[PDB]
Design a protein around this ligand. Structure first.
Ligand SMILES: Cc1cc2ccnc(N[C@@H]3CCNC[C@H]3C(=O)NC3CCCCC3)c2[nH]c1=O
Length: 125
């Protein structure tokens, strides 16, 4: 009932190492990954195990920090904006699927506030 996870490597997709992508792995992801609210976002939503049968009927662009971590580790991104877009997709999915008063929404809001603080101090290329 789960889709395959988002791709985290591609032999055809070009790759480079930049200080901005290094900052996103070493500072931004690392900060969010170890946060007390990170754990529901550390892997793709398992709709079977979590008993959320409608999840992938509603969310057609799934994204999670486990996938973002692998993409950064695998040099999948060419630029920082591709990675920032994936974080925004993850937060947006959470706000669309869940009810406004749900604890997962409060957890996502806390992580997004921390995320935007760290992106505000992104170093120049
Ligand atoms: C990404 C993600 C994961 C997830 C896991 C479990 N449940 C979710 N949604 C609950 C649906 C029912 N109402 C309560 C919702 C909720 O806020 N659950 C949280 C999960 C984390 C621990 C506190 C309770 C999920 N929704 C997601 O978007």
């Amino acid at each position: 009932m789960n889709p395959p996870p988002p791709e985290t490597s591609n032999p055809n997709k070009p790759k480079r190492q930049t200080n901005q992508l290094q900052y996103l792995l070493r500072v931004v992801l690392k900060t969010l990954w170890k946060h007390q609210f990170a754990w529901p976002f550390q892997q793709p939503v398992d709709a079977v195990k979590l008993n959320l049968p409608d999840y992938y009927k509603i969310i057609k662009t799934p994204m999670d920090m486990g996938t973002i971590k692998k993409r950064l580790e695998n040099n999948y991104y060419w630029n920082a904006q591709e990675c920032i877009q994936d974080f925004n997709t993850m937060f947006t999915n959470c706000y669309i699927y869940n009810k406004p008063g749900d604890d997962i929404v409060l957890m996502a809001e806390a992580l997004e506030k921390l995320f935007l603080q760290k992106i505000n101090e992104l170093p120049t290329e």
